[PDB]
Amino acid sequence: VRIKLCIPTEDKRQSDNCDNDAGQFFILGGTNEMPWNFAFPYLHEITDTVLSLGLALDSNYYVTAEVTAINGTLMPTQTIPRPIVTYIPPQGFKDVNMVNMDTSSLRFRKDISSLTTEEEYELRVAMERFMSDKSINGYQALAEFHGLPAKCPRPDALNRVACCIHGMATFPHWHRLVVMQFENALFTRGSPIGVPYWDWTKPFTALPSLL
Amino acid sequence: NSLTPSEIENLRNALAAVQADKTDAGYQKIASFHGMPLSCQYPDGTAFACCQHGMVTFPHWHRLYMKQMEDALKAKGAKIGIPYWDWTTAFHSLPILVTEPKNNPFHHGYIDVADTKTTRDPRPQSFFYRQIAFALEQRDFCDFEIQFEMGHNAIHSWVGGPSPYGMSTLHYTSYDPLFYVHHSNTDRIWAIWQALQKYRGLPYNSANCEINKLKKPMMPFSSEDNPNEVTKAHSTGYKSFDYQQLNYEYDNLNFHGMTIPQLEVHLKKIQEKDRVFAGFLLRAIGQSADVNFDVTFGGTFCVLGGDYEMPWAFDRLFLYDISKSLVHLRLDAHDDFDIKVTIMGIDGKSLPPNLLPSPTILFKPG
Amino acid sequence: RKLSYNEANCALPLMNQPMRPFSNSTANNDRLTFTNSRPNDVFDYQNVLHYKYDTLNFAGLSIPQLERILQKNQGRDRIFAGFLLHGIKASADVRIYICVPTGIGEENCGNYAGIFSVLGGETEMPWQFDRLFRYEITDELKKLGLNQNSHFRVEMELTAVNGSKITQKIFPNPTIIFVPSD
Ligand SMILES: *[C@@H]1O[C@H](CO)[C@@H](O[C@@H]2O[C@H](CO)[C@@H](O[C@@H]3O[C@H](CO)[C@@H](O)[C@H](O)[C@@H]3O)[C@H](O)[C@H]2NC(C)=O)[C@H](O)[C@H]1NC(C)=O
Numbered sequence: 001v002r003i004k005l006c007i008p009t010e011d012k013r014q015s016d017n018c019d020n021d022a023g024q025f026f027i028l029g030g031t032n033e034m035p036w037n038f039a040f041p042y043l044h045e046i047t048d049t050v051l052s053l054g055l056a057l058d059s060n061y062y063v064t065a066e067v068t069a070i071n072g073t074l075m076p077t078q079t080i081p082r083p084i085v086t087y088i089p090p091q092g093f094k095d096v097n098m099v100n101m102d103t104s105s106l107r108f109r110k111d112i113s114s115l116t117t118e119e120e121y122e123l124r125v126a127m128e129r130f131m132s133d134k135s136i137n138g139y140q141a142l143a144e145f146h147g148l149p150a151k152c153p154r155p156d157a158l159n160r161v162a163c164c165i166h167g168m169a170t171f172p173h174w175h176r177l178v179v180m181q182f183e184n185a186l187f188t189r190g191s192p193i194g195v196p197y198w199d200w201t202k203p204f205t206a207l208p209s210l211l
Numbered sequence: 212n213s214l215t216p217s218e219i220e221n222l223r224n225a226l227a228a229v230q231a232d233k234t235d236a237g238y239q240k241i242a243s244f245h246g247m248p249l250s251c252q253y254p255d256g257t258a259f260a261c262c263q264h265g266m267v268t269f270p271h272w273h274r275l276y277m278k279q280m281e282d283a284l285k286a287k288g289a290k291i292g293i294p295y296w297d298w299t300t301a302f303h304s305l306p307i308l309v310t311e312p313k314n315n316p317f318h319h320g321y322i323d324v325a326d327t328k329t330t331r332d333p334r335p336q337s338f339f340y341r342q343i344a345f346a347l348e349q350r351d352f353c354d355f356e357i358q359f360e361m362g363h364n365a366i367h368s369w370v371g372g373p374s375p376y377g378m379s380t381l382h383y384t385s386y387d388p389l390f391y392v393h394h395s396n397t398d399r400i401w402a403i404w405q406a407l408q409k410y411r412g413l414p415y416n417s418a419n420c421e422i423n424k425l426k427k428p429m430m431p432f433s434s435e436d437n438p439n440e441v442t443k444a445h446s447t448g449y450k451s452f453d454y455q456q457l458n459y460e461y462d463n464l465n466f467h468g469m470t471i472p473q474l475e476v477h478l479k480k481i482q483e484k485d486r487v488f489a490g491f492l493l494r495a496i497g498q499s500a501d502v503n504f505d506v507t508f509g510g511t512f513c514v515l516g517g518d519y520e521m522p523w524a525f526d527r528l529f530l531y532d533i534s535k536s537l538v539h540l541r542l543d544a545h546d547d548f549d550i551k552v553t554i555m556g557i558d559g560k561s562l563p564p565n566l567l568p569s570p571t572i573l574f575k576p577g
Numbered sequence: 578r579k580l581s582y583n584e585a586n587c588a589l590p591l592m593n594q595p596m597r598p599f600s601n602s603t604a605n606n607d608r609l610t611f612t613n614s615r616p617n618d619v620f621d622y623q624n625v626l627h628y629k630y631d632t633l634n635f636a637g638l639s640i641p642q643l644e645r646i647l648q649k650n651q652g653r654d655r656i657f658a659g660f661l662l663h664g665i666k667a668s669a670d671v672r673i674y675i676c677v678p679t680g681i682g683e684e685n686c687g688n689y690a691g692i693f694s695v696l697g698g699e700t701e702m703p704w705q706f707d708r709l710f711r712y713e714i715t716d717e718l719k720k721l722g723l724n725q726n727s728h729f730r731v732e733m734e735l736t737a738v739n740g741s742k743i744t745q746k747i748f749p750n751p752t753i754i755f756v757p758s759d
């Protein structure tokens with residue numbers, strides 16, 4: 001597996017600078033091989049070449065892999081899960097601060113139990129109207145975002161998959177955004193609250209009466 | 212504002228104290244430098260007014276000048292720094308210290324050269340807020356200064372009015388206690404900006420335009436005859452950027468109600484809407500005058516200047532948003548318009564015509 | 578041009594089969610169109626179909642000065658993209674892009690050059706063009722500072738009328754033809 005270091009393309013054209021190769025490694029295997037998977041990621045240091053190209057270790061770039069079988073046969077990229085860049089900051093480093101205090105309003109997401117009956121009814125109405133009825137700006141579209149009308153990478157064409165991120169470090173980013181969508185959707189339809197949460201961490205006997 | 216007696220209390224006496232040192236200056240020498248009595252010489256030794264406005268190194272000179280002044284209350288119970296009043300924040304009236312008629316050191320100054328105390332003649336959302344915020348918007352230092360200087364002198368125009376002995380004039384302004392206090396503020400504004408940059412990773416204690424001029428030393432702060440060691444040390448341009456080694460502190464660099472980070476959000480927020488500006492070329496003229504805009508009212512802005520001042524010309528244009536004017540006429544920056552202006556002298560007359568050339572008119576999205 | 582205007586040398590077996598709906602006794606009952614169902618009969622519209630066009634000048638240009646424009650157009654070096662087209666199952670829209678390599682390393686691709694359309698529907702009679710369709714890409718290459726000798730290539734990007742639903746390559750790759758000055 002040859003390691004190519006790529007610099008992303010802005011435009012439609014596939015102009016991604018993958019010219020400069022960052023690394024290289026090898027894999028022993030065979031037929032009637034014992035099935036196996038390292039329980040931990042293999043890390044191949046690319047810091048030096050990343051420094052050579054004059055782009056910060058922090059900044060955006062990616063890594064692609066050329067898998068050549070020992071047979072000499074060039075192999076499909078699908079053979080191996082795509083490489084990732086892992087960044088190790090100078091310890092210790094505090095990431096940038098949050099914005100000071102609060103002003104003048106933020107959507108407040110409460111425990112479902114903390115909801116007054118009024119709040120229950122009002123976000124019930126918001127949900128009721130968002131859901132009923134259907135549109136492009138409606139509930140079913142957002143419900144469709146996550147999974148199975150399969151619009152990924154694009155709703156075209158040949159092979160489509162679910163859009164939601166799973167088995168990745170970016171899972172919670174994706175679903176955070178999604179929850180924000182839901183929030184806007186309910187706010188514009190007339191609810192004073194941010195989307196409430198239910199602690200499943202707290203021991204519970206039954207589902208909240210809300211759902 | 213927010214002062215607690217006797218915090219107010221200590222100071223008058225200190226200002227009182229230096230009214231006559233009067234040896235070092237004691238205060239009149241300290242006054243002369245911005246003021247009328249002649250600071251320096253061309254090599255021909257001709258009178259100059261050692262005023263360092265109109266140039267890019269404009270803040271340092273002053274920001275110092277506060278220092279010289281600031282030091283001057285030294286161990287005279289100069290227990291806190293010169294206060295600042297945020298003229299940005301709209302105000303129905305002037306601030307006390309400089310108003311109270313009786314037994315107050317801030318009412319006026321005197322002038323051995325003229326035999327008189329200062330006379331001031333005030334003249335009639337907040338205008339300065341809008342004007343300053345723009346300055347903050349900018350990222351180039353030079354770009355910032357032009358607006359920063361012009362936002363500034365708008366007050367030397369309006370505080371003084373039509374008295375030769377006053378804040379409207381270069382000659383005797385420095386004499387009026389009101390002048391420093393206005394400054395602290397002007398200086399404060401500058402500081403805020405530095406914090407801004409710093410936030411943005413742009414240079415703040417440095418500045419890339421123009422390398423020319425920050426290096427020229429500054430008189431009088433240069434002069435041998437300045438018996439304060441400190442200012443001479445930073446008499447230079449490039450020193451005096453980091454006001455930290457002064458050493459003073461502002462209570463808080465927050466524009467009204469805004470974290471610095473908050474502030475950028477604000478400006479960033481403003482920036483969404485596409486704007487339209489007018490920019491003038493301004494250049495030296497002996498007199499000091501105010502200029503009134505038109506297309507409805509678009510005005511206005513003022514220029515500070517006096518006899519025997521070093522001539523100056525700004526490198527860059529001075530911008531003044533006139534979008535509210537267009538909406539007023541319902542124009543789209545598309546329909547095309549005549550930008551009409553007027554330009555009064557501080558003395559009662561007389562709106563002489565440019566002088567300044569023609570205003571360009573430019574559009575910023577968005 | 579003194580070249581045949583009411584006859585066609587180019588297609589010979591096709592000019593004598595009467596038009597299939599117009600030759601069908603049902604449901605074409607108009608004797609005019611029925612009688613002239615053959616292509617050859619439809620060549621002269623004026624004598625046969627009894628109509629005229631108000632002016633035959635195009636773009637306000639009389640036919641002599643039109644032919645002049647055409648020939649002066651032939652005057653310069655031009656570059657064309659050739660397309661071998663045939664019947665898709667349905668109608669689709671093809672866009673034309675020009676790929677210019679950067680020095681290091683191997684490189685692509687698109688700046689927008691053109692667009693043309695292909696018509697169709699299910700149950701259409703199958704068809705294959707026996708010659709290239711040409712698309713002048715000369716001026717776009719001029720705007721890229723490119724040449725006929727300069728290194729570059731031409732890619733088509735095909736979008737169905739379904740609504741997006743971009744298609745994989747169904748047509749042979751674009752030819753590049755150079756025509757020297759007249
Ligand atoms: C709009 O999108 C669909 C998405 O597939 C296009 O697919 C077309 O679908 C037809 C049948 O729905 C396909 O026909 C099939 O062809 C294969 C052989 O390739 C044959 O084994 C099947 O029995 C069937 O006949 C067709 O391949 C496919 N055509 C293309 C190029 O998309 C549909 O065509 C699109 N609609 C339009 C406007 O063309």
Ligand SMILES: *[C@@H]1O[C@H](CO)[C@@H](O[C@@H]2O[C@H](CO)[C@@H](O)[C@H](O)[C@H]2NC(C)=O)[C@H](O)[C@H]1NC(C)=O
Nearest residue numbers: 595596597598599600601602603604605606700
């Ligand atoms: C001439 O046209 C007629 C119809 O215009 C053809 O007869 C059929 O018409 C029915 C009407 O519903 C259609 O369902 C059939 O499909 C038509 N013909 C078929 C079955 O092909 C008639 O066939 C045509 N004659 C010729 C030889 O073209």
Ligand code: CUO
Nearest residue numbers: 146164165166175
């Ligand atoms: O499923 Cu993807 O979100 Cu819990």
